[PDB]
Design a protein around this ligand. Structure first.
Ligand SMILES: [Mn+2]
Ligand SMILES: [Mn+2]
Ligand SMILES: [Mn+2]
Ligand SMILES: [Mn+2]
Ligand SMILES: [Mn+2]
Ligand SMILES: [Mn+2]
Ligand SMILES: [Mn+2]
Ligand SMILES: [Mn+2]
Lengths: 437, 437, 437, 437
């Protein structure tokens, strides 16, 4: 029907000259007590994969897709058929979408709702016969001209109302299709210039908005995990949920912290000047690592590139964080990635996903070994042991004060420290990377 | 004695060809209900001004200073004499210092304390005859090899003890000289690599450390304002108090929030990818704008340059934030700036400070007009008025929910927004800048 | 007709509360021996101003324009009428355009040519009754899907042919409408990944392409100035004419240097990690400062923002370079700027241009004073005078060698240098900025 | 004597739990027709390895080294003994140094020369019994206060003379010890501010300086390869030889191009916003890839970090460029890297170098396979074949013009392009990385 050239993609192993096969991702291979499929919980982004056109700030849409002949609802329906065909052939457990990705917006809200329901009906009775499930859905509060000054942070109370309606419908669809999570991304929730901005009001309203959401979620009995996806900027000059930490500060200020977890996207972390691992670590130690958008940016380019994950250091390092968190739990590895404008052929959708999946399979395999062999843990445990005994243990138990500490410091000679062993640790990481065979 | 060429610097007005005079900073000129001196509360950084040598990662110290002939305690004493001479000639209300700036460290802690006390005695009986007062002092927990793995975040509990002692002595000196504030800067409180880092432990300990400090402060009856100075990185690959917001998250997590306010440094804000104004705004709307380090970096250079503030847009924009905060209160405008390595002559210390002071005088003058003429406020007030009436007011009073908002959105036609008027606002800013005459 | 609200914009002076008037740009005010209009040679970018829609990588077109009701050729024609109305009301001497800005592309090249000719006929007989003239035009070799792998650097020789045709027609239109310059921008002339790139071939072909152009220009008797507009990246991961210097290297390698000059755009310079002034200076000292795209980016944002020039330090500093070059000569100050997505009203096109024009008027005024008062020149002349006499003069005349220099160095004691006086120079700049009254 | 713990480091293979052994670098393993040792031509940087102290812009020297007990010439001599011991134990073919690294500077030039000669005598009669040879030496024209305004670009002609003398002596030492290359790095050859800079003069003088050098080199009969090492900035706000391309432009302008080749350092390339491979590629296609400084920076940190190369993608990708250049020829892989301040123990010097050497061994191994299997070449050859036949071949032979190309374009339908296959190529790269076993 849509992808006729492509037959169902299978795991063929490392020594395999077949471009359309998994070299490392074996869905049922066990890594510890769970299979690769259970560990990785892969998900495809509806937006990039089925509605993306390869357009560029300086280029027109160039993507070649079979469903391009259609318009309107025919196109919406065509994409659903295509979507599920792609899911089956690639063997993906999950997918994600924004409301505007699946159905065309109407001239009035009532219309939008109609088109949406139609498409949701179609999606529901398809899930019926597919292994693929909805990881999370979300409301697109940034693309329409109406959200020009924000959504919940808009200076126009009508826009606040409209955004609320689209999130209300969003949660209903989530409940209906049994989404495991619901994602919020504040694309326009920031500022373009402080000069015309009442920041305290905007933040107050953003909090009021989120409160209303968690309330509605209870009322309809949603029970899926609420997620916030941080980003430093783009489109905005400054986006409010800049960081995992920055968003955390916000949630704490307004007492929304217990209702939320974070959706961390690699490209977003690097754009904030942090490493992907760093953002995962911070989320993790706060018990707020909700889910992951697995992509990769270019660190020499200051905008989102949404590339597929091929860098094995990143995947390894990310997986290490994820495994230590006890896994993704309710979230998954959603490929919020996009083929390069130069990879405009249909088969590139497959090449791209295989690349990302194999890269994460490798990362899972090695991150796991690093953990079971206590490669880094062995050392960390050894270098922090001063806090296990004597004065250190007093500091930790909370039985030390400036008096005792000063008294102690006074009898101290030259303090001796040991190496952080960075080059060694880095060398070790390489050795484990290369021991994938 | 030290600066013989230089006579006491006076305000001479705009049309004055004299390089050694204030063109805009008139200590007693009234701007609103306070004089420029009361508004600006200028302070000089002991470190850069009296101990800086113009060294460079690739260059040896090149600064030419009169007190260079001396060594050890003679040098420490010489600098104090020089310091107060400089304060008098420049007419500065305040100064700041790290413990290591004023006295040479000893081979043992007991020695360090002796040298410190000697110099503190000398400083105290000098304040006796000077208008200059101590804005804030601080403990240098980054320069010594002992702090290589952090101070309170060190993996060596002995280093935690040592840091605690130096902060204990720090607070005693603060109490003794009547410092208005006490600053903490976590130069080594971060990481060089996550690979060997137990982040949750380090953060836990940083919190335990700060708790012990606020406890000691109560015990000795300090009552000055505790300040935390954020920075994204340098020396560390990642410094924990990355941001005003990031540090806020930390303080909230450990319940230290009521004891602290922030010391915001321009170069640090830009290094985190924020504008100076932005950091002030965020601090301000949280009632945590404690004090300012008035410098300026180069946005094309990714390290701290600590230049003197000459950019008038920045000074204006910063002052606007400060005035809206109700002023600096207990803090001040500490010139944590440093002359360019090319400006190695003694007179450059004066040229530099005059430049920074005049620039802030201008900024104060125009920021004030912008505020009294309601230039930006007029507009902000107008564009957010939807939240004053009808549905908007319901949202704010907290009497709205997804139901009412959706009901409202359903009867809505095309939503109309108005321009953010950015170019206009920017044009206006220029007009006010140019109306300084 | 199109802008009914707006009446012809006039110079009203500094103290004028009228938003729709020039506060500093007085077309006929003399600054030295030329009027502001002759100095500034302002130009409007057809693309942003008449075809821009405010779309955003995450947002749909939101701009409100009177000619939006039209489609196809009606829209093309409508825009021409509108364009000239705007030119008249704003009093602009020049404009610029890409072929695709003025007429809709056809399904075949022959069609494209037809539509183009029609619109060119219309433009020509309009210039007939207008003061506005064509500064430069250019061929858009980046927007169409066909240029996905480059134009002259494309791996598809058919695309090379097509690009050549569009540049051929481009030069004919230039000759016909009497363009003063012709601009080349290599938007897709770079790479997305080195992995599939034969760089030496691409560069060889880029040179062959440019050679063919200067040859055709001679054949048809064009005689306008060829210009190359550098940019580091975006859309490309790396664009070949990265820099003024990088492009220079290229032109020198292939002997195209005498035929070209540079079109420098502020945002592009900052994106390459240079200051606007820097790029102008480099071009200038090589006699290759051809023309300017007067915009401004955000240094905290790593993509082109194309803002209107409001920063007065930049305009002053740029104008200083331009005046020292002996003026723009054949080029001009083309506003390759774009209103913020938040400034979506028609009147913002006017506010924006007024802002940019006044900002450059101010910059011209003060840059000129700096030059006539020899503010910086006085000093530069003094600090380099060692090369005027003795050994220095020998070095310059070329009568010195390592022998004499070593002999000299051997008899030298401690070398004495003097301050670079940076803070002083910066302070001075401010004083002149503020003396605009 | 110096490194007693450490015994001579040997190649032990991949499965080896010994931290002090090569896992991948086997000096005599053949890769193609040359052994790993002949291919890699490793070199150690005297400066970082023997004179580095781990100091930091905010930290004192913390490095622990056996020769620290000594001062003056005893220290200089001690380091030479240590240096050669290290070379032997690590089995390094080459080393590099700045004049100031090996001997202490005197109070007068005559003194400096004496100390230098003494140490050079010692080095010479040590090379006598060692396999290690001098890859290249250089003159340090940035560390001394005298070079504050540049060296050859200094505004003080006495400094130009002094720099010339130190370069003259530099070339004599090179000739004497048989250096294969001589490196120039313009650390202070740039500007801190354009405001006081006569750029054309500075550049003119830089060229005069380099001319005098190549002349002296001929006079004394040096015959080693002159190298220029580009860098964008640091210490300077802008360094003149910003880029490989920028430096190329300079050399072309002054006709120095035939005498020079480039020394490319990874961290410098990334700092200019280019990838390491990119800089090598550009140099390479111009026949100017002279030698390499093998380090690695952090792309989230905007200053030189000089880390040891552990990232295998980089080493692979760099080696691919080097192999295609026909190897390093006369240059080598000089570890201009430095241990992290946290790796302050003596044994870290070994861990660090092993890490870098193994990483490059791996890179050599896989880069070679990529080349022999024509992995990328196969594809590049296929996608550019339009330039082999028909119109394409005409373009290349130089028998095409705008007329023929337009005529051709006119008969063209829809142009068809094929995928750039980026994700595929990236996936392939991973497969080869993982096939190192
Ligand atoms: Mn993204
Ligand atoms: Mn995302
Ligand atoms: Mn600082
Ligand atoms: Mn500071
Ligand atoms: Mn642009
Ligand atoms: Mn442009
Ligand atoms: Mn370096
Ligand atoms: Mn180097």
């Amino acid at each position: 029907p849509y992808f006729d050239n492509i037959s169902t993609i299978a795991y063929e192993g490392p020594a395999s000259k077949n471009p359309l096969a998994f070299k490392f991702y074996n869905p049922e291979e066990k890594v510890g007590d769970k299979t690769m499929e259970e560990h990785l919980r892969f998900s495809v982004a509806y937006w990039h994969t089925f509605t993306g056109d390869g357009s560029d700030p300086f280029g027109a849409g160039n993507m070649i897709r079979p469903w391009n002949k259609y318009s309107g609802m025919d196109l919406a329906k065509a994409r659903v058929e295509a979507a599920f065909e792609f899911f089956e052939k690639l063997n993906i457990p999950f997918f994600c979408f924004h409301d505007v990705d699946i159905a065309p917006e109407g001239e009035t809200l009532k219309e939008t709702y109609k088109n949406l329901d139609i498409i949701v009906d179609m999606i529901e009775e398809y899930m019926k016969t597919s292994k693929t499930k909805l990881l999370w859905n979300t409301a697109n509060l940034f693309t329409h001209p109406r959200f020009v000054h924000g959504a919940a942070t808009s200076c126009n109370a009508d826009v606040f109302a409209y955004a609320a309606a689209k999130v209300k419908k969003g949660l209903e669809i989530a409940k209906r299709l049994g989404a495991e999570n619901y994602v919020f991304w504040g694309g326009r929730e920031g500022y373009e210039t402080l000069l015309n901005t009442d920041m305290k009001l905007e933040l107050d309203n953003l909090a009021r908005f989120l409160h209303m959401a968690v309330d509605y979620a209870k009322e309809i009995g949603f029970d899926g995990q609420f997620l916030i996806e941080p980003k430093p900027k783009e489109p905005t000059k400054h986006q409010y949920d800049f960081d995992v930490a920055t968003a955390l500060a916000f949630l704490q200020t307004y007492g929304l912290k217990d209702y939320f977890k974070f959706n961390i996207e690699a490209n977003h972390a690097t754009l904030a000047g942090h490493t992907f691992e760093h953002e995962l670590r911070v989320a993790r130690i706060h018990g707020m690592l909700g889910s992951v958008d697995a992509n990769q940016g270019d660190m020499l380019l200051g905008w989102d590139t949404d590339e597929f994950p091929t860098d094995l250091y990143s995947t390894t390092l990310a997986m290490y964080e994820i495994l230590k968190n006890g896994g993704l739990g309710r979230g998954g590895l959603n490929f919020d990635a996009k083929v390069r404008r130069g990879s405009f052929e249909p088969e590139d959708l497959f090449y791209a996903h295989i690349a990302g999946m194999d890269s994460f399979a490798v990362g899972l395999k090695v991150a796991h070994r690093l953990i079971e062999d206590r490669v880094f843990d062995e050392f960390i445990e050894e270098r922090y042991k001063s806090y296990t005994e004597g004065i250190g243990r007093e500091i930790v138990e909370g039985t030390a004060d400036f008096h005792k500490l000063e008294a102690h410091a006074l009898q101290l000679g030259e303090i001796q420290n040991q190496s952080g062993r960075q080059e060694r640790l880095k060398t070790l990481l390489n050795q484990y990377l290369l021991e994938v065979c």
